[PDB]
């Protein structure tokens, strides 16, 4: 199976309140496992997945020390970018980075990420090939020229096939038992009266993990993908997720309609009838 | 482990 290690970085200025808020959030596959937040009472790297306790004091020190370095760097980045864009000193701005690697079971790098955003807009990213950059405007092009002078892509590539891979391997070695965790969706169908004459049945998927799921409504064999109303998957806040999907039907033959739930933690897709 | 970030 493939696996990924990704970091989600965020630095937000706030002039008139002191230091920019800096954060580093860590992800194995889609599960947050580490977190640094500059605003916490004691701004250190903290575990976010039980299985990270098994890392001794040196790990957390090393990572904390590095965040503080990264924090400093970004603190400056926000000013440079202010200049690049010839912006006032007043208001608050955001830099965001996604950084990390996707590697196969054979330990080869499938994909490497290093993407940047300023104020919610693409700024610059390392291309699929890991050697060239895509800048999204004239400010980003200044960064681009500096990085080519400095040999940044090559460096990243070194980290992405080396460092990134080896830490993921360990991170998997540590909490592999836990990351398999699936919680099967418990499903029910609810009936709702409407005006006019028609009715809408709403198909629920409750208490499932991870969030990937699929809900489909079908009239006795053929699925309706144009009349279906759905909500975005949402957390219950207990660890599990929820989603529903509804459809408008004529009154009398609501039994003719079947709901289908597809989730990786289910031996068989659930097929529900009202 | 997160990379040491380059300056933009």
């Amino acid at each position: 199976g493939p696996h990924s290690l990704r970091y989600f970085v965020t630095a937000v200025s706030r002039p008139g309140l002191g230091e920019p808020r800096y954060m580093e959030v860590g992800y194995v596959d889609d599960t947050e496992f580490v977190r640094f937040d500059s605003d916490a009472e004691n701004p250190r790297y903290e575990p976010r997945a039980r299985w990270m306790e098994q890392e001794g004091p040196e790990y957390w020190e090393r990572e904390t020390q590095k965040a503080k370095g990264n924090e400093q760097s970004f603190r400056v980045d926000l000013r440079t970018l202010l200049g690049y864009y010839n912006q006032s000193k007043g208001g608050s701005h955001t830099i965001q980075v996604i950084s990390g690697c996707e590697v196969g079971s054979d330990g080869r790098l499938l994909r490497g990420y290093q993407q940047y955003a300023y104020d919610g807009c693409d700024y610059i990213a390392l291309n699929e090939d890991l050697k060239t950059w895509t800048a999204a405007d004239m400010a980003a092009l200044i960064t681009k020229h500096k990085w080519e002078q400095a040999g940044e892509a090559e460096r990243l590539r070194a980290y992405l096939e080396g460092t990134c891979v080896e830490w993921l391997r360990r991170y998997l070695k540590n909490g592999n038992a836990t990351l398999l965790r699936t919680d099967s969706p418990k499903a029910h169908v609810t009936h709702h009266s409407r005006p006019e004459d028609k009715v809408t049945l709403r198909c629920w998927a409750l208490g499932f993990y991870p969030a990937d799921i699929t809900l489909t409504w079908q009239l006795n064999g053929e699925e309706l993908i144009q009349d279906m109303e759905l909500v975005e998957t949402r957390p219950a806040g207990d660890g599990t997720f929820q989603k529903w999907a509804s459809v408008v039907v004529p009154l009398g033959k609501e039994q003719y309609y079947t709901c289908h739930v597809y989730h990786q933690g289910l031996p068989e897709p659930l097929t529900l009838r009202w | 482990s997160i990379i040491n970030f380059e300056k933009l």
Partner: antibody
Amino acid sequence: VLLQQSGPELVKPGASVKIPCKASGYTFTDYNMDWVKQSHGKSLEWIGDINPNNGGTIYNQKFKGKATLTVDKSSSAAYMEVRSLTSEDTAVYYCARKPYYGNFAWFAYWGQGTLVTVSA
Amino acid sequence: IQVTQSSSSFSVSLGDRVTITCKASEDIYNRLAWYQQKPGNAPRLLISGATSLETGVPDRFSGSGSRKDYTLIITSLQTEDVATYYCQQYWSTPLTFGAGTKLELKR
């Protein structure tokens, strides 16, 4: 390319000193200014750098609070202030320049270095 | 990331082949530089990126190594090579130097 520093400084325990570094022979604003400390005991140690366009600073966690970096963009000049001096601060302080702009490089040019002696 | 030079001083003869080791505490991926320094002067850049000879530096200076083990080579020690030598990594920040290897003439 040339980075000119001041001559020897004799200073007293508890006091502080400010070392200048005047740069010439290149576009000041396209580079940063790094500072390095050399002393019996720890040899060469990094310290920090300054951005000449906005005075943005990065410090070695080891020197945070012990050193302050400033820039005069217009006279192409960088200054370091080492505060609350101990005998452990007695050393030669270099300013230096990477061959390009970035966090990860080597130092292609050095100032002549300024010896600082802490004594009462 | 600690950079370690084992030998702090080294006795040498003119014409010798001299090898100065530099040991990194983590893989530094060839991001290593070498400086030469003579008394009362600032360090002078000899080599960057592990094997790359800086302009002006004489041809008798050479670099090699991988991962976390690097060497500075001087194939035939001339008299003005009597100096102290420093290696400096830049794979991670803060940039960190070794403690130097000081050469001295045998007699």
